[PDB]
Design a protein around this ligand. Structure first.
Ligand SMILES: Nc1ncnc2c1ncn2[C@@H]1O[C@H](COP(=O)(O)OP(=O)(O)O)[C@@H](O)[C@H]1O
Ligand SMILES: Nc1ncnc2c1ncn2[C@@H]1O[C@H](COP(=O)(O)OP(=O)(O)O)[C@@H](O)[C@H]1O
Lengths: 235, 235
């Protein structure tokens, strides 16, 4: 019956915002490698929505060149007059982006070319801004250090989020007005399976729409039917 | 008038033999990077002459492949029936060389390919023998560690010989029957200039042949004329 809230502040959200503002004021590189679907991507957008001098792209592996990725960052900076060459684009980024005290957020940092991440790290360095890397744990695996040596020397605050915590789903249940202890344990058990935040959010939205269509309150059995869907135990 | 001695035991010779026997009994890798002409090449040959289960090649950059270098080591092992392919040669080295408790000495380790030194390190490891690297200080510079990471994990005893010592040239003067303190200081000053052992040996041999041709004893002025040759201050 109430409006579903899309985003909730969580212990991971608190941690990752402190890491984000750390790389902001620190003006240095923060790599966030974690298990898939730990909720990092969404929080980054909440940081972008709440804070000034913040930018974010995503990297599809289609846009995984230096040219394409810097073009993406340039259009995110609003310079629609960006040149299609590498060089003058790099110069335009260097003139535009330095002195703003900003924070670049880059998601899926595993698909970075060495020249790609190389130009990014030398950018932020020659720009006095923030760069923050996201994605899975292949990002730190791509460094483990003569090709990534000075970059491993840059690294300010890595934060690994493997899975959720109990206060994480507890604040989730607080935001979704969930009071059952059986409900809380079931939410925790759903959080034990991967795609944690996503599956939990899906399960929450299934139960909310089912209880709204039936005119009832979200309860434990709606959550059981929701989790009984999705083919999680079906190969 | 006496016979010139070709080789003299020296503090560097003592140090480097202890490093050599260390990598022998240890059956592990010892990198000897030093200034050019520190006398390391000759001592290695004295170790080869005095000790059993010892082998040595040199690496010209002509023979700088895996195939050519392992062929050189194979002919040094006396297997003249060595195959001209990489694989069966590697197998023949693996069968021949394991169980002998030997010591391979490799000179000019700066011209090693990554596959070359790679096959050498995996050889000694799969062979329970000794490998010892020689040459200038570019050998350690080629490692400074994801391409050379496990190799930098192998390293047992690096010994850097930059220049000579005073007991070095003192034992040289003892072997060459030199008693002058002016002579000793002049020998030390010659040792301060690069190509130390080589120039000193050249100077010793110039003075010996000049004093033998003039029927006299080697003295300070013959050493001065010898050092006045060679165009050391002439560009
Ligand atoms: N605080 C939150 N509240 C609700 N859903 C969240 C929250 N944080 C993340 N999510 C969910 O996580 C997903 C977005 O991030 P996600 O895809 O998990 O990132 P990544 O795949 O990079 O780990 C969406 O399902 C989103 O609803
Ligand atoms: N103990 C020694 N006695 C006399 N000459 C020596 C001695 N050790 C080295 N040398 C001289 O050094 C040279 C051989 O080694 P060298 O060429 O200096 O090795 P590297 O070039 O690898 O440093 C020759 O000039 C040799 O006569």
């Amino acid at each position: 019956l109430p409006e579903p809230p899309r985003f909730v502040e969580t212990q991971t959200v608190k941690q990752i915002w402190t890491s984000m503002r750390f790389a902001s004021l620190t003006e240095s590189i923060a790599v966030v490698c974690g298990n898939p679907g730990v909720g990092k991507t969404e929080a980054a957008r909440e940081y972008r929505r709440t804070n000034n001098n913040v930018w974010m792209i995503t990297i599809t592996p289609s846009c995984a060149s230096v040219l394409e990725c810097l073009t993406e960052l340039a259009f995110e900076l609003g310079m629609n007059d960006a040149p299609r060459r590498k060089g003058p684009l790099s110069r335009a980024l260097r003139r535009r982006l330095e002195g703003t005290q900003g924070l670049v957020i880059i998601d899926e940092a595993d698909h970075l070319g060495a020249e790609v991440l190389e130009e990014l790290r030398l950018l932020q360095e020659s720009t006095r801004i923030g760069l923050v890397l996201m994605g899975n744990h292949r990002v730190y695996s791509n460094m483990t250090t003569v090709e990534f040596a000075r970059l491993f020397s840059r690294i300010a605050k890595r934060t690994a989020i493997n899975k959720t915590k109990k206060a994480d789903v507890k604040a989730i249940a607080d935001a979704w007005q969930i009071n059952g202890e059986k409900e809380l344990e079931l939410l925790q058990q759903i959080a034990q399976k991967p795609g944690a935040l996503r599956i939990l959010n899906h399960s929450l939205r299934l139960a909310a729409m089912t209880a709204h269509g039936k005119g009832e309150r979200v309860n434990e059995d709606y959550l059981r039917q929701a989790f009984r869907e999705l083919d999680l135990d079906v190969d």
